[PDB]
From a paper:
Dimethylsulfoniopropionate (DMSP) is a ubiquitous organosulfur compound in marine environments with important functions in both microorganisms and global biogeochemical carbon and sulfur cycling. Here, through comparative genomics analyses, genetic manipulations, and biochemical analyses, we identified an ABC (ATP-binding cassette)-type DMSP-specific transporter, DmpXWV, in Ruegeria pomeroyi DSS-3, a model strain of the MRG. DmpX, the substrate binding protein of DmpXWV, had high specificity and binding affinity towards DMSP. In Gram-negative bacteria, they usually consist of three subunits: a periplasmic substrate-binding protein (SBP) responsible for the primary recognition and binding of substrate, a transmembrane domain constituting the translocation pathway, and a cytoplasmic ATP-binding domain to hydrolyse ATP and provide energy for transport.
Residue numbers in the entry: 24 to 322
The structure:
């Protein structure tokens, strides 16, 4: 049967839905005993590399983890599936109204030459995200500070998101890291600053704390996966099979997030809502036994 299971909950909205839906399916469907570990990309990958826990890492954004392939080779982790099946795109953004009022902010060089247009500030992703390493590398490669752009490190994904909302309310400038599709970007039309042509080797270097030779590249489009420890896999073929199926298209994730905001729903309430209304999506994720358990508890 299924006993003790630990799973990361990453510190942003889609990630919460992912972990909450997974938890519910594991507990109700397979009688799992699930410990949700609040986490972030960097300490989470660090934690499995060192303690072989937690069992399940998700969402795992692969855009800026250049050493993940190696981790999987050494058999420290195993990729089950892309949990956001459409993927996502990270970048540096300004509000649409700003890009329309002053089109020169649509390229990084344009911004660097006229920092007042963005209020002399860049909003950096928070400590614990792989993106914080990249942004920090890019700030250096473009010499933001030297050009009068202050790199402001947000304390969390929440305060990063709120700084957009605040700026937007008053139609003020904003320049910083974010990603799409997200609720924030659906609610506040943003435009991606052109950071030049993608370069795999430059980005790999930007993604590594120890690579000093930083260069200019935008982020690649992200694959976003659920991963597990081969130990947990060996032990729980049924959960692995289920987690190999558990996945959301961006439309599906959007539809859940919206519902959770139009109500005051907890993450748990959103999960129940998704499962209750989307049998056609998830029925195939679970096995017959689990589906018996779920059929009986869900309504
Ligand atoms: C929230 S994500 C879009 C990226 C996560 C990370 O950079 O560690």
């Amino acid at each position: 049967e299924c006993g003790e299971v630990s799973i990361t909950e990453m510190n942003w909205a889609s990630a919460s839905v992912v972990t909450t839906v997974a938890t519910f399916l594991m507990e109700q469907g397979y009688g799992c005993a699930v410990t949700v570990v609040p986490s972030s990309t960097v300490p989470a990958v660090t934690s499995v590399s060192e303690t072989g826990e937690p069992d399940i890492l998700t969402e795992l954004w692969l855009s800026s983890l250049p050493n993940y392939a190696k981790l999987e080779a050494q058999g420290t982790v195993r990729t089950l599936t892309e949990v956001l099946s459409d993927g996502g795109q990270e970048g540096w953004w300004v509000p649409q109204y700003l890009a329309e009022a002053h089109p020169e902010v649509t390229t990084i060089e344009g911004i660097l030459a006229n920092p007042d247009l963005v209020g002399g500030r860049f909003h950096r992703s928070p400590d614990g995200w792989a993106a914080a390493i990249v942004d920090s590398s890019l700030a250096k490669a473009w010499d933001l500070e030297g050009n009068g752009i202050e790199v402001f490190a947000h304390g969390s994904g929440e305060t990063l998101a709120t700084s957009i909302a605040a700026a937007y309310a008053d139609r003020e400038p904003w320049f910083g890291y974010y990603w799409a599709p997200t609720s924030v970007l659906g609610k506040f039309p943003m435009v991606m600053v052109d950071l030049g042509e993608f370069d795999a080797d430059i980005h790999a270097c930007n993604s590594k704390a120890d690579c000093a030779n930083v260069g200019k590249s935008p982020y690649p489009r992200a694959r976003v996966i659920t991963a597990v420890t081969p130990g947990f896999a060996e032990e729980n073929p049924e959960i692995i099979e289920m987690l190999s199926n558990l996945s959301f298209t961006n439309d599906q994730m959007g539809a859940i997030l919206a519902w959770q905001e139009e109500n005051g729903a907890s993450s748990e309430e959103a999960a129940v809502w998704f499962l209750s209304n989307n049998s056609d999506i998830w029925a195939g994720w679970v096995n017959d036994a689990a589906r018996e358990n779920l059929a009986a508890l869900i309504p």
